[PDB]
């Protein structure tokens, strides 16, 4: 690798990508942020991983939390630091003050501490070091100039010792100064910043690397979530555009469509089904999920508009029994309110569920559901995610989008996702003679030929029926057409009189 | 209750922000959905006739069945019309019907078959030679059948 | 935050009443509502016919239209 | 016909029945003199109508 600085791997999901390799060895990285931002996890997890994958003993210095507590809490994710401290792979060094204290002690203790840390590392032969909340230390009675000097010292002794440290820090404002005294930002070799942006009642955590003295890295805020597995970052910008593309075909659950689609969807393609509310995008998906199961494949359905219960009533009324689909262990339905989490979260829940089940087909009913309230740039960035994942994983996708205005929609999507998708299947209402009739159209397919006809289709108990187009109609997209006739009566099967039978016999 | 009805969610979305509304809706919606309570919600589109969207607040998606009322300008007169726009479990009629209101109530008559652009409120009457073909004078091929 | 465990992130609206604090996790409620194949009238028989037999007992019904159209009646 | 003529209408009456027609109406030293509707026009509401003058049934 072409980077003048040799980095060490955190093994935290994706941080390495963002940092183009992980922390620089022999240096210190200031990880700062407000309260509940992830600081202590990051630090802990940074030592942990060096222990479980590289047998790199680590020293963990705490100034506020108790040594008992860092262990107690650490179990939350499923790590037994206890045992590690037992095998001497992890030394916890307690520097918290006492419940029955005095006043004054932060300079010769900084010297005593350095001399302390040197020891632990020497004794445990450690290669990784964390220092949690150095901030709280000068929080006895100090000012800017005294901190800079006292930090500098610690950091410098650490680098001479050759340790790859990590210092955590607090801030007050999410976007103001980086640290408290506004001096940590310039004495560290690297600065990693954690945020927990409020914004509209929800809460979004991001991780940013402001600087790495010596190398490139990924500029800007990147979303991440804390789970039962620790931190987890999504390099929504590091995701390269090198997904595989084949010419294979897969049914749509509906034959006629397939025809219309040059011969059934592409295995490797993102499918977009737009249309007014009530047009039957939901239906189509149901058939698309079904068909994978009828052929013995796995597919997940993520519904953000209908309950798992209702999703079944309607699914049965349209034939196709989803109950069995759940049983034969082929179809898996999710169901989740978009308001029950942010985009960073939903994105992961989906991914995860995509791993624990290895679908071959995936269908997210109503992306425009996920668009509720979110900023377009945040939504577009979500779409790109799920979409991308699905592409680079050979998993066909069927996404749904509902247009804010029935009939008269001058655009495929109000979020302009248009160009992200590969194929588009359109649905709309047609005011034909005091009646609302459905019409289906295959607007675009990237690799195929697809029919260029706006066929009328009726919904039944059996499901979708794809008839023919309103040839003798102008202003079809207008929703409310106009009927011009150069013919109509023309052949097709004229011959009058008694052409039919009735229920008795024919 | 076994049935609940809210007259004008459109009343509640006065002033209050959108996201805060959609939240209220989901609220009074799901509680009624899990508690086994059928509910009828009322929305008044800010603009009579020509309304291009079911609801200004975009709730239409969080609902099971949509019933739509809309004025229709017919011969200098403002008449009503109703349509079961959508229903998730059922079949439902696709005809945009007319309807009068009296002392008895709502009488749903017929659909406007001889018209165009009904949804826009100001339709275009368009009979000018109803479906019997220009052969209303049936050409004159039928001049041989009857005789002496 | 809750050092050590998980929780729900974000603000949540609650109301101080005669029964103290009442918080509505409008994001915690789950999408597990019960759904049946039952029908119910509306008060308009014809409407019942158009809808396909009647509104389902388990559902939400919306009534839109300009001012004066007659939703309040329905 | 290139003239700005008025029209009145009871859009909605909550209790009563009220007339549904869009009636022409002029103004003079006597006050409002409501006339007849535009029975033979289309799109009145829009403001710029369109007389129908339908060729009846054309025999
Ligand atoms: N198992 C878990 N699953 C999901 N979230 C968790 C889990 N454990 C902890 N959290 C969350 O992680 C956060 C813990 O933050 P952490 O202890 O890492 O450091 P901090 O908040 O940056 O700094 P400080 O120790 O001063 O609070 C909490 O806000 C909590 O909501
Ligand atoms: N058994 C059925 N028989 C005939 N038509 C049906 C049947 N079930 C549903 N429909 C029709 O399909 C519509 C239901 O829409 P569907 O569930 O397919 O998804 P959608 O219209 O794309 O999106 P959404 O349901 O969120 O509005 C109804 O409005 C209705 O006209
Ligand atoms: N007794 C009646 N006889 C004939 N028509 C009536 C009678 N009562 C009301 N109407 C008609 O019905 C309309 C009343 O509308 P309705 O009470 O159904 O509620 P809405 O349009 O949904 O809301 P809002 O009452 O605020 O306008 C009137 O505009 C009127 O034309
Ligand atoms: Mg904190
Ligand atoms: Mg901490
Ligand atoms: Mg739906
Ligand atoms: Mg919908
Ligand atoms: Mg009203
Ligand atoms: Mg009212």
Author numbering:
A (entry chain F): 14 to 519
B (entry chain A): 372 to 519
C (entry chain A): 224 to 297
D (entry chain B): 446 to 504
Quote the study that presented this structure, word for word.
The combined structural data expose subtle changes in the orientations of the H423-I433 loop region harboring phosphorylated residues relative to the γ-phosphate of ATP compared with the structure of wt-KaiC.
The circadian clock of the cyanobacterium Synechococcus elongatus can be reconstituted in vitro by three proteins, KaiA, KaiB and KaiC. The crystal structure of KaiC from S. elongatus revealed a hexamer in the shape of a double doughnut with approximate dimensions 100×100 Å, whereby the N-terminal CI and C-terminal CII halves of subunits are joined by a 15-amino acid linker. Two phosphorylation sites (P-sites), T432 and S431 that are both located in the CII half were identified in KaiC.
